[PDB]
Design a protein around this nucleic acid. Structure first.
Ligand code: MG
Ligand code: MG
Length: 342
DNA sequence: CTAGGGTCCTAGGACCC
DNA sequence: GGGTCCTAGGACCCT
Protein backbone atom coordinates (compact mmCIF):
# COMPACT_ATOMS: atom_id res chain seq x y z
CA UNK A 1 0.00 0.00 0.00
CA UNK A 2 2.93 2.35 -0.63
CA UNK A 3 2.37 5.38 -2.88
CA UNK A 4 4.91 6.93 -5.24
CA UNK A 5 5.02 10.76 -4.90
CA UNK A 6 7.15 12.95 -7.17
CA UNK A 7 7.88 16.58 -6.32
CA UNK A 8 9.13 18.50 -9.37
CA UNK A 9 10.80 21.87 -8.78
CA UNK A 10 12.35 24.28 -11.32
CA UNK A 11 15.91 25.49 -10.66
CA UNK A 12 16.38 29.24 -10.01
CA UNK A 13 13.07 29.58 -11.79
CA UNK A 14 12.70 33.32 -12.52
CA UNK A 15 16.46 33.65 -13.04
CA UNK A 16 16.64 30.53 -15.24
CA UNK A 17 13.98 32.06 -17.51
CA UNK A 18 15.82 35.38 -17.82
CA UNK A 19 19.06 33.62 -18.75
CA UNK A 20 17.38 31.47 -21.38
CA UNK A 21 15.79 34.58 -22.89
CA UNK A 22 19.06 36.56 -22.64
CA UNK A 23 22.22 34.44 -22.73
CA UNK A 24 24.32 37.47 -21.73
CA UNK A 25 23.04 36.95 -18.17
CA UNK A 26 24.26 33.35 -17.94
CA UNK A 27 27.57 33.90 -16.17
CA UNK A 28 27.21 37.21 -14.31
CA UNK A 29 25.41 37.43 -10.94
CA UNK A 30 21.75 38.33 -11.51
CA UNK A 31 18.64 38.59 -9.36
CA UNK A 32 14.97 39.39 -9.87
CA UNK A 33 13.94 41.98 -7.28
CA UNK A 34 12.98 45.57 -6.58
CA UNK A 35 15.74 48.15 -6.47
CA UNK A 36 17.09 49.37 -3.14
CA UNK A 37 15.53 52.75 -3.98
CA UNK A 38 12.13 51.00 -3.98
CA UNK A 39 12.98 49.22 -0.70
CA UNK A 40 12.79 45.92 -2.61
CA UNK A 41 13.89 42.36 -1.87
CA UNK A 42 15.35 39.53 -3.88
CA UNK A 43 12.74 37.24 -5.40
CA UNK A 44 15.46 34.88 -6.52
CA UNK A 45 19.01 34.82 -7.86
CA UNK A 46 21.17 32.76 -10.19
CA UNK A 47 24.08 30.59 -8.98
CA UNK A 48 26.76 33.25 -9.65
CA UNK A 49 24.87 35.65 -7.36
CA UNK A 50 24.18 32.96 -4.71
CA UNK A 51 27.95 32.37 -4.54
CA UNK A 52 28.12 35.84 -2.94
CA UNK A 53 25.40 34.85 -0.44
CA UNK A 54 22.48 36.42 -2.32
CA UNK A 55 19.27 34.61 -1.22
CA UNK A 56 15.49 34.86 -1.79
CA UNK A 57 13.79 37.36 0.57
CA UNK A 58 17.07 39.22 1.25
CA UNK A 59 16.64 43.02 1.32
CA UNK A 60 18.10 44.28 -1.93
CA UNK A 61 20.49 46.67 -0.14
CA UNK A 62 21.95 43.66 1.68
CA UNK A 63 22.20 41.73 -1.60
CA UNK A 64 24.16 44.61 -3.12
CA UNK A 65 26.53 44.91 -0.17
CA UNK A 66 27.27 41.20 -0.56
CA UNK A 67 27.48 41.40 -4.36
CA UNK A 68 28.20 44.87 -5.75
CA UNK A 69 27.98 43.82 -9.43
CA UNK A 70 24.55 42.19 -8.97
CA UNK A 71 22.42 42.85 -12.03
CA UNK A 72 18.87 43.56 -10.89
CA UNK A 73 15.90 42.55 -13.04
CA UNK A 74 12.26 43.63 -12.60
CA UNK A 75 10.59 40.36 -13.55
CA UNK A 76 8.54 39.19 -16.52
CA UNK A 77 5.60 37.39 -14.97
CA UNK A 78 3.90 36.39 -18.23
CA UNK A 79 7.15 34.65 -19.20
CA UNK A 80 7.16 32.74 -15.92
CA UNK A 81 3.45 31.91 -16.17
CA UNK A 82 4.01 30.62 -19.69
CA UNK A 83 6.78 28.26 -18.59
CA UNK A 84 4.55 27.27 -15.66
CA UNK A 85 1.70 26.30 -17.97
CA UNK A 86 4.13 24.38 -20.14
CA UNK A 87 5.58 22.22 -17.38
CA UNK A 88 2.09 21.47 -15.99
CA UNK A 89 1.07 20.22 -19.43
CA UNK A 90 4.25 18.11 -19.46
CA UNK A 91 3.12 16.73 -16.09
CA UNK A 92 -0.28 15.87 -17.59
CA UNK A 93 1.34 13.57 -20.18
CA UNK A 94 2.22 11.29 -17.25
CA UNK A 95 -0.74 11.56 -14.84
CA UNK A 96 -3.71 13.72 -13.96
CA UNK A 97 -2.76 13.37 -10.28
CA UNK A 98 -1.11 16.82 -10.26
CA UNK A 99 -1.13 19.26 -7.34
CA UNK A 100 0.67 22.50 -8.24
CA UNK A 101 2.09 24.38 -5.26
CA UNK A 102 3.34 27.58 -6.98
CA UNK A 103 4.29 28.49 -10.55
CA UNK A 104 7.40 26.34 -10.61
CA UNK A 105 6.55 23.15 -8.71
CA UNK A 106 3.97 20.38 -8.27
CA UNK A 107 3.33 17.12 -6.52
CA UNK A 108 2.61 14.11 -8.75
CA UNK A 109 1.06 10.85 -7.53
CA UNK A 110 2.34 8.24 -9.97
CA UNK A 111 1.36 5.22 -7.85
CA UNK A 112 -1.01 3.98 -10.57
CA UNK A 113 1.20 4.95 -13.51
CA UNK A 114 1.96 2.73 -16.50
CA UNK A 115 4.84 4.87 -17.81
CA UNK A 116 8.46 3.76 -17.44
CA UNK A 117 7.52 0.31 -16.09
CA UNK A 118 5.96 1.97 -13.05
CA UNK A 119 9.37 3.34 -12.04
CA UNK A 120 8.84 6.66 -10.28
CA UNK A 121 12.60 7.30 -10.58
CA UNK A 122 12.50 7.04 -14.37
CA UNK A 123 9.28 9.04 -14.62
CA UNK A 124 10.90 11.89 -12.71
CA UNK A 125 13.98 11.72 -14.91
CA UNK A 126 11.93 11.65 -18.11
CA UNK A 127 9.91 14.64 -16.89
CA UNK A 128 13.08 16.60 -16.08
CA UNK A 129 14.60 15.69 -19.43
CA UNK A 130 11.41 16.60 -21.26
CA UNK A 131 11.30 19.96 -19.47
CA UNK A 132 14.91 20.64 -20.52
CA UNK A 133 13.99 19.76 -24.05
CA UNK A 134 10.95 21.89 -25.04
CA UNK A 135 11.72 24.73 -22.55
CA UNK A 136 15.55 24.89 -22.19
CA UNK A 137 15.12 25.12 -18.42
CA UNK A 138 16.31 22.56 -15.90
CA UNK A 139 14.34 21.04 -13.04
CA UNK A 140 15.15 18.95 -10.01
CA UNK A 141 12.91 16.26 -8.54
CA UNK A 142 12.32 14.30 -5.38
CA UNK A 143 10.75 10.82 -5.16
CA UNK A 144 9.35 9.47 -1.88
CA UNK A 145 6.33 7.61 -0.39
CA UNK A 146 4.65 10.75 1.03
CA UNK A 147 4.47 14.42 0.01
CA UNK A 148 6.77 16.11 2.49
CA UNK A 149 9.66 13.68 2.06
CA UNK A 150 9.38 14.06 -1.73
CA UNK A 151 9.48 17.85 -1.39
CA UNK A 152 12.53 17.67 0.90
CA UNK A 153 14.14 15.26 -1.59
CA UNK A 154 13.84 17.58 -4.59
CA UNK A 155 16.09 20.11 -2.85
CA UNK A 156 18.84 17.63 -2.05
CA UNK A 157 20.33 17.08 -5.50
CA UNK A 158 19.54 20.44 -7.03
CA UNK A 159 20.20 21.90 -9.64
CA UNK A 160 19.37 19.51 -12.46
CA UNK A 161 19.29 16.38 -10.32
CA UNK A 162 16.97 14.19 -8.30
CA UNK A 163 16.91 12.14 -5.10
CA UNK A 164 14.89 9.02 -4.22
CA UNK A 165 13.88 8.04 -0.67
CA UNK A 166 12.62 4.43 -0.37
CA UNK A 167 10.55 3.17 2.58
CA UNK A 168 13.56 1.17 3.77
CA UNK A 169 15.60 4.42 3.80
CA UNK A 170 12.95 6.53 5.67
CA UNK A 171 14.08 5.86 9.29
CA UNK A 172 17.76 6.70 8.66
CA UNK A 173 16.81 9.83 6.72
CA UNK A 174 14.47 10.98 9.51
CA UNK A 175 16.86 10.48 12.42
CA UNK A 176 19.10 13.50 11.65
CA UNK A 177 16.65 15.55 9.54
CA UNK A 178 16.38 19.09 10.97
CA UNK A 179 12.81 20.03 11.86
CA UNK A 180 13.22 23.28 9.94
CA UNK A 181 13.39 21.32 6.69
CA UNK A 182 9.77 20.10 7.02
CA UNK A 183 7.59 22.42 4.90
CA UNK A 184 5.56 24.46 7.37
CA UNK A 185 8.12 24.47 10.17
CA UNK A 186 9.55 27.96 9.73
CA UNK A 187 12.01 30.14 11.61
CA UNK A 188 9.73 30.91 14.57
CA UNK A 189 8.72 27.31 15.19
CA UNK A 190 12.25 26.01 14.69
CA UNK A 191 13.47 28.48 17.31
CA UNK A 192 10.82 27.43 19.83
CA UNK A 193 11.57 23.78 19.07
CA UNK A 194 15.31 24.41 19.39
CA UNK A 195 14.83 26.19 22.71
CA UNK A 196 13.23 23.07 24.18
CA UNK A 197 15.95 20.81 22.76
CA UNK A 198 14.12 19.68 19.61
CA UNK A 199 16.25 20.08 16.48
CA UNK A 200 15.64 16.92 14.44
CA UNK A 201 12.89 14.42 13.75
CA UNK A 202 14.88 11.94 15.82
CA UNK A 203 14.53 14.41 18.71
CA UNK A 204 10.76 14.62 18.26
CA UNK A 205 10.41 10.84 18.07
CA UNK A 206 11.49 10.71 21.71
CA UNK A 207 8.55 12.99 22.61
CA UNK A 208 5.02 12.36 23.86
CA UNK A 209 2.20 13.16 21.43
CA UNK A 210 0.12 14.44 24.35
CA UNK A 211 2.82 16.96 25.28
CA UNK A 212 3.17 18.10 21.66
CA UNK A 213 -0.60 18.61 21.44
CA UNK A 214 -0.76 20.71 24.61
CA UNK A 215 2.21 22.88 23.65
CA UNK A 216 1.50 23.32 19.93
CA UNK A 217 -2.09 22.26 19.23
CA UNK A 218 -2.77 20.76 15.83
CA UNK A 219 0.76 21.77 14.82
CA UNK A 220 2.16 19.43 17.48
CA UNK A 221 0.28 16.53 15.91
CA UNK A 222 1.79 17.41 12.51
CA UNK A 223 5.24 17.56 14.13
CA UNK A 224 4.74 14.18 15.79
CA UNK A 225 3.53 12.61 12.54
CA UNK A 226 6.14 14.07 10.18
CA UNK A 227 8.95 12.99 12.52
CA UNK A 228 7.89 9.40 11.80
CA UNK A 229 7.50 9.77 8.06
CA UNK A 230 3.71 9.90 8.52
CA UNK A 231 2.11 12.12 5.92
CA UNK A 232 -1.21 10.82 4.65
CA UNK A 233 -2.10 13.98 2.73
CA UNK A 234 -3.40 13.05 -0.72
CA UNK A 235 -2.26 14.69 -3.92
CA UNK A 236 -5.25 16.89 -4.74
CA UNK A 237 -5.67 18.13 -8.29
CA UNK A 238 -8.85 20.12 -7.50
CA UNK A 239 -7.56 23.09 -5.47
CA UNK A 240 -8.89 26.53 -6.37
CA UNK A 241 -7.90 30.14 -5.79
CA UNK A 242 -9.56 31.78 -2.76
CA UNK A 243 -8.37 35.38 -2.86
CA UNK A 244 -6.71 38.04 -4.92
CA UNK A 245 -4.73 40.99 -3.65
CA UNK A 246 -2.75 43.93 -4.99
CA UNK A 247 -0.38 45.88 -2.78
CA UNK A 248 2.58 48.17 -3.23
CA UNK A 249 5.34 49.36 -0.90
CA UNK A 250 6.36 52.91 -1.81
CA UNK A 251 9.92 54.17 -1.97
CA UNK A 252 9.18 56.60 0.89
CA UNK A 253 6.69 56.41 3.74
CA UNK A 254 3.50 58.44 3.42
CA UNK A 255 1.88 60.52 6.15
CA UNK A 256 -1.14 62.17 4.46
CA UNK A 257 -4.48 60.64 3.56
CA UNK A 258 -4.31 62.34 0.15
CA UNK A 259 -1.20 60.29 -0.62
CA UNK A 260 -2.88 57.07 0.53
CA UNK A 261 -5.93 57.81 -1.60
CA UNK A 262 -3.80 58.53 -4.67
CA UNK A 263 -2.15 55.12 -4.27
CA UNK A 264 -5.48 53.29 -4.02
CA UNK A 265 -6.64 54.95 -7.25
CA UNK A 266 -3.74 53.24 -9.06
CA UNK A 267 -4.04 49.93 -7.21
CA UNK A 268 -7.75 49.57 -7.93
CA UNK A 269 -7.69 49.18 -11.76
CA UNK A 270 -5.08 46.45 -11.33
CA UNK A 271 -7.20 44.58 -8.79
CA UNK A 272 -10.19 44.93 -11.11
CA UNK A 273 -8.39 43.58 -14.18
CA UNK A 274 -7.02 40.59 -12.27
CA UNK A 275 -10.37 39.73 -10.67
CA UNK A 276 -12.12 39.99 -14.05
CA UNK A 277 -9.92 37.28 -15.59
CA UNK A 278 -11.28 34.81 -13.03
CA UNK A 279 -14.69 36.39 -12.30
CA UNK A 280 -15.99 38.58 -15.15
CA UNK A 281 -18.95 39.84 -13.16
CA UNK A 282 -16.63 40.94 -10.29
CA UNK A 283 -18.83 39.04 -7.82
CA UNK A 284 -16.91 38.23 -4.63
CA UNK A 285 -17.43 37.29 -0.98
CA UNK A 286 -15.43 39.99 0.86
CA UNK A 287 -13.21 42.95 0.10
CA UNK A 288 -10.78 44.86 2.22
CA UNK A 289 -7.62 46.86 2.62
CA UNK A 290 -4.17 46.55 4.14
CA UNK A 291 -1.77 49.10 5.63
CA UNK A 292 1.73 48.45 6.90
CA UNK A 293 3.21 51.14 9.10
CA UNK A 294 6.81 52.32 9.43
CA UNK A 295 7.13 50.25 12.66
CA UNK A 296 6.24 47.26 10.38
CA UNK A 297 3.06 46.42 12.25
CA UNK A 298 0.38 45.54 9.70
CA UNK A 299 -3.39 45.73 9.84
CA UNK A 300 -6.12 44.39 7.60
CA UNK A 301 -9.77 45.19 7.61
CA UNK A 302 -12.17 43.43 5.35
CA UNK A 303 -15.85 42.72 5.30
CA UNK A 304 -18.63 40.87 3.56
CA UNK A 305 -19.32 42.65 0.30
CA UNK A 306 -20.92 41.31 -2.88
CA UNK A 307 -18.95 42.97 -5.72
CA UNK A 308 -15.61 44.79 -6.18
CA UNK A 309 -16.20 48.44 -5.33
CA UNK A 310 -13.54 51.18 -5.38
CA UNK A 311 -15.33 53.75 -3.21
CA UNK A 312 -15.96 51.29 -0.41
CA UNK A 313 -12.27 50.36 -0.48
CA UNK A 314 -11.37 54.05 -0.24
CA UNK A 315 -13.88 54.46 2.60
CA UNK A 316 -12.52 51.43 4.46
CA UNK A 317 -8.95 52.63 3.94
CA UNK A 318 -10.01 56.02 5.32
CA UNK A 319 -11.33 54.45 8.55
CA UNK A 320 -8.22 52.27 8.90
CA UNK A 321 -6.05 55.31 8.24
CA UNK A 322 -7.86 57.34 10.90
CA UNK A 323 -8.79 54.61 13.37
CA UNK A 324 -5.56 52.60 13.74
CA UNK A 325 -2.63 54.53 12.28
CA UNK A 326 -1.80 56.45 15.47
CA UNK A 327 0.37 58.98 13.65
CA UNK A 328 3.00 56.58 12.34
CA UNK A 329 4.04 56.65 8.69
CA UNK A 330 2.79 54.10 6.15
CA UNK A 331 5.06 52.12 3.83
CA UNK A 332 2.54 49.79 2.12
CA UNK A 333 -1.05 50.11 0.91
CA UNK A 334 -2.93 47.02 -0.21
CA UNK A 335 -6.31 46.03 -1.59
CA UNK A 336 -7.80 42.57 -1.15
CA UNK A 337 -10.75 40.42 -2.15
CA UNK A 338 -12.04 37.07 -0.88
CA UNK A 339 -13.55 34.90 -3.61
CA UNK A 340 -16.94 33.17 -3.49
CA UNK A 341 -16.91 29.59 -2.27
CA UNK A 342 -17.48 27.30 -5.18
C1' DC B 1 16.99 46.67 6.23
C1' DT B 2 13.26 44.41 5.49
C1' DA B 3 8.11 42.37 -1.64
C1' DG B 4 4.22 40.59 -3.58
C1' DG B 5 1.78 36.75 -4.76
C1' DG B 6 -0.81 33.55 -1.85
C1' DT B 7 -2.72 29.26 1.92
C1' DC B 8 -3.88 27.76 6.39
C1' DC B 9 -4.58 28.10 11.47
C1' DT B 10 -6.20 30.39 15.74
C1' DA B 11 -9.27 32.94 18.58
C1' DG B 12 -13.32 35.81 20.65
C1' DG B 13 -17.93 37.37 20.13
C1' DA B 14 -22.19 37.01 17.48
C1' DC B 15 -25.73 34.23 16.34
C1' DC B 16 -28.31 30.04 16.26
C1' DC B 17 -29.96 25.78 18.85
C1' DG C 1 -22.05 24.59 25.93
C1' DG C 2 -21.50 23.17 20.72
C1' DG C 3 -21.37 24.61 15.39
C1' DT C 4 -20.66 28.12 12.53
C1' DC C 5 -19.89 32.87 10.71
C1' DC C 6 -17.35 37.12 11.09
C1' DT C 7 -13.16 39.34 11.51
C1' DA C 8 -8.00 40.16 12.68
C1' DG C 9 -3.54 38.66 13.01
C1' DG C 10 0.29 35.81 12.15
C1' DA C 11 3.26 31.80 10.61
C1' DC C 12 4.41 30.07 6.50
C1' DC C 13 4.89 28.96 1.41
C1' DC C 14 6.80 30.34 -3.45
C1' DT C 15 9.86 33.18 -6.64
MG1 MG D 1 12.40 26.34 -7.63
MG1 MG E 1 9.46 25.85 -6.36
Amino acid sequence: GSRKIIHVDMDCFFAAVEMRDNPALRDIPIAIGGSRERRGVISTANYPARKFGVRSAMPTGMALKLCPHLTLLPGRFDAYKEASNHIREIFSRYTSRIEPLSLDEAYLDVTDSVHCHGSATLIAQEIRQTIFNELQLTASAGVAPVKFLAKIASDMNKPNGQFVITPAEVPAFLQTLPLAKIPGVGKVSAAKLEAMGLRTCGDVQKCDLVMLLKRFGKFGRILWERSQGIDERDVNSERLRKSVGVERTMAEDIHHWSECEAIIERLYPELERRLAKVKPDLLIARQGVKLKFDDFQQTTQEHVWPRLNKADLIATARKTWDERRGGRGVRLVGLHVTLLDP
